[model samples]
Target chain A: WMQRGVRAVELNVAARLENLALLRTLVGAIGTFEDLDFDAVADLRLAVDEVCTRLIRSALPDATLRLVVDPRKDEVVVEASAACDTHDVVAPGSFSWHVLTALADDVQTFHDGRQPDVAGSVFGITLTARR
Target chain B: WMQRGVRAVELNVAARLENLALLRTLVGAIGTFEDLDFDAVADLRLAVDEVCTRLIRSALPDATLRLVVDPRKDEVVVEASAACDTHDVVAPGSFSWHVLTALADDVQTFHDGRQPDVAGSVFGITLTARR
Candidate 1:
């Protein structure tokens, strides 16, 4: 039988460049917790920074950036989401997206229509890196 | 006029000993972001670890540990809270509490009665370390 793990960490912060270091640090710390090698830890740190940087740039004013880090048995999955004015702000095939894909094993982006509670569209990036 | 800053980072994680490293890493990262010296960073890291350790020990099974790190102009304030079976689990005047006081400039503990939404009492510790 398959079982699910319940250990995951979630972070919420204002969408700003100044908070990028905090995000990177937490992701790198999770890398260390999973016993990832030095190179792998550095890769995840860079990947998280790039992804969050993109979201922050495209996010609406005073947007809150949310990130969830789930460390599974063999890999680490990270999802970052923010509210943006437009859907295609973090378009694929861009240099920054390329950098993100190069670092993470899997990369995907999704957008949800604007909700009554939020002012803009919800854009998110989900990535996974092997331990 | 006194103005309040809005740059604060919040983290939610399972209350387990294994997750301690992740919390320390984030606090240390914030120290670095705030340009705190090495010694100060180390102190904050240790303080965070000690405070969370106590909470984890007293928290109920599968409790969610929530932490907020607020880096103000001159100091970094961290608050950690978790649902516990009873209040006074992390009593004052203990050795661990002393350690926390030694590392941070200010330390306080609070407890709220059990609520219907939550299974048990809510216990929390708030500590502040100079940058």
Candidate 2:
């Protein structure tokens, strides 16, 4: 894919320590998508780490996380997810959900029934072309 | 009982410029919950800004958010939500969730139901203390 008109990039932040690199890649990619300045990207790098760190701190011992970055012609897409035990629990609705997607161009979430093959759980964030 | 409190804290990102202070608070709070190194915290702050930036840029003019931070005795609980203009969108509950919880002591996600008053939609990330 990289040889032709296709490019696929995936990052694995299985451990909290490994996330720093992921943050840089995510924020740096801004240059590829839009005209964001250094401060803008730096500020963004900070926020992305919080989300990533929260995940690392909450993950199960057996948990596995992978970030797939697909940079398109006019934009960049970042998909972030985690695999957790079936017994774990979280609230169905309210403020927390409202706080997450508040920053993104578009945010989508799903559960077990959505994907029967999903042995665990998942979430995602995408960066598109815009101010 | 903060011994088992679930406190969700949500700070609205009206614009990308308003995220620096948020970073300080988030990084500092990590102290009470976990004993992490300076480098670790720095990397996390960097990553979180990225998520916040994406959301701020993508946020709708009508967007509203409320964070529910429940601090448990054994752990400090936090929930974040974003009330985006759109819900019911389809996302495979896989990678993003995996990445989000990769750094934590514990994590869980519930969706679509369990709260109808959710005029827009809701999602959350909970924090628990381990080491």
Candidate 3:
């Protein structure tokens, strides 16, 4: 394995709807390989889809979405980033934002704005059961 | 209901990554409203994502992905159609094709090619547990 009792996966796909199945499959496989529960699998799958979707909307021309997934003994940490313009943080009232928070044990977002030096946004979510 | 236990849902969204959450949630809601089993719900969700992802790849400029779900006592049939150029049929051995076939009781595709009158493709998947 990539590491002791841990597995990692990285994916880069065209910033388009057509490539999202690959994303869904990739995340779902991590959940499966980690033997996460069905609910957890579904939850993580949904969270990834949401975060990636948000990142891609502000994508620059010819941008590619990148995702890194690290599966641990009791949790899965997923990071999704993409080349995109600055965007506002997901509003707390947003349905997707609410769902993301509800599903993940902890969630955070990253963005460097459209500064000349900064080019995109990053979102990380961790899924785990009650401690 | 829209037509008597035949609840129908139609969605048209941008052919971009951010819109998939709406798609996933849309399909998941149909399964929940129909009181489908967890496995069946997931199976249908995955199938829709796969079919739509394929269609979106061949999409025309500014195209939108459209989905229509018809739920019944015995089956939930999902039709994902989009404006796109003609493309080859999914190969028999492709990972997605196999999963689509396995998850749905029946799956079919429609395309008129780039013919003058043809403008897009359609995929239909039916999900129902064994009789």
Candidate 4:
């Protein structure tokens, strides 16, 4: 019944803009669980919102957005992924991308080109914030 | 980018008491997303806490607790499952069980007998609440 060690939590939701608030609530809860400062939590909430917004834009129809939140001793890492049809879903020089970079200590995007059985490529963004 | 049909969200977290708050936060967010009344949201939150507490008590070491939150047109269904070594992890006549029954419109528990590759049986609780 006692808490032992920090563990990861994965959230899978419909790839829609309406669900952004729910995702933000989750990140806030995770940040509070990790004893993160108020500023860090606020930054993460905004960062996740921006990241998910881009993913939802390029997500295939009826695709599911999967986010894995891992809380480490000194940092919290969040990775959001969805099935996207284009490789350039999240441009690095875009305004949203710059906002994402400013909110998190590190931000990276990846695209696993189209694979068998998958309607599109698997695109993801990894955001890390230090506690 | 637009909101379409409702989709289910699955959350996987370590089986520990500390994570109960996080789970409650998730249920609250889901309730708000579904536009459930304040009282209904409060009831579901309490019900989920009791159900998860029982699961954590009987969960195996290093087990992961999984919860699937499905929002429907008229109701929300939540299923929580974990690997348990005993079948009587949740007693129907117990106080906690009675509390859970009072909080949720429909409550059911299931035990999938021991299976290959699984160290213990899979015990779960399904709770439904009307919007």
Model 1 stretches astray by more than 4 angstroms: A1-7, A36-43, B1-6, B36-42
Can you give the DockQ of every candidate in the order shown? 0.57, 0.02, 0.02, 0.62
After best superposition, candidate 1 residue B78: deviation in angstroms?
0.9
Model 2 regions lying over 4 Å from their true place: A1-5, A17-44, A85-99, A113-118, A123-131, B1-131
Instruction: List model 4 lDDT by residue over B1-131, tens digit each.
Output: 22324567888889877777788777776677776677987888888888888888888877789898887778778899998868867687988888988999999988757566553477889998896
> Could you tell me the C-alpha RMSD of candidate 2 in Å?
19.6
Candidate RMSDs in Å, in order, are 3.8, 19.6, 13.3, 3.9
Q: Mind giving the per-residue lDDT tens digits that candidate 1 earns over B6-51?
A: 6788888888888887777667766677755678678878888887
lDDT of 3 by residue, B78-98 (tens): 767666655643556888789
Over A1-131, each residue of candidate 2 has an lDDT whose tens digit, in order, gives 13211233344434344444534544355333434444534444544554455455555554545554444454445555565443222233634334444544444543463565444454443332223
Query: Highest lDDT: which candidate?
Result: 4
Worst 10 residues of 1 chain B by lDDT: B1-10
True contacts kept of each: 0.78, 0.00, 0.00, 0.74
Q: For model 3 chain A, where is the 10-residue window of minimal lDDT?
A: A1-10
The CAPRI classification for model 4 reads as medium
Give a tens-digit lDDT track for model 4, residues A13-80. Answer: 89877777778777776777776667987898888888888889888877889898887778778899
TM-score of each: 0.82, 0.36, 0.44, 0.86
Give me the displacement of residue A131 in model 2, in angstroms: 4.8
Candidate 1 local lDDT, residue A110? 83
